[PDB]
Amino acid sequence: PYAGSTD
Amino acid sequence: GGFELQPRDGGPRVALAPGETVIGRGPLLGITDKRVSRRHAILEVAGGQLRIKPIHTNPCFYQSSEKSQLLPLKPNLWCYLNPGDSFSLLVDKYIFRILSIP
Helix, strand or coil: CCCCCCC | CEEEEEECCCCCCEECCCEEEEECEECCCCECCCCCCCCCEEEEEECCEEEEEECCCCCCEEECCCCCCCEECCCCCCEECCCCCEEEEECCEEEEEEEEEC
16 A cells, blocks of 8 residues: 555 | 654654664555655664655655744755654644654
């Protein structure tokens, strides 16, 4: 749940 | 001298190890908000002191123990955090107060 690109 | 982080909302304390710790979106603080970078800031515990350096374009904020305003920190510069001070990774959320350990 801490992955993915930053806004 | 060591340090813990106390979320302003009253949640569990966060223990900090000696040396450098990258903070932001991750398991250490439990932050899942995509507005927070996974590499948002550096915390350094050394010689009985704690300092923070923002390392992202999305800013960090600092509130001295005597003041009452989260002020934005300059990018890529170190700022010392005294016991009782607060910092945040958003303007109005993910705020943490600094606590000292013997």
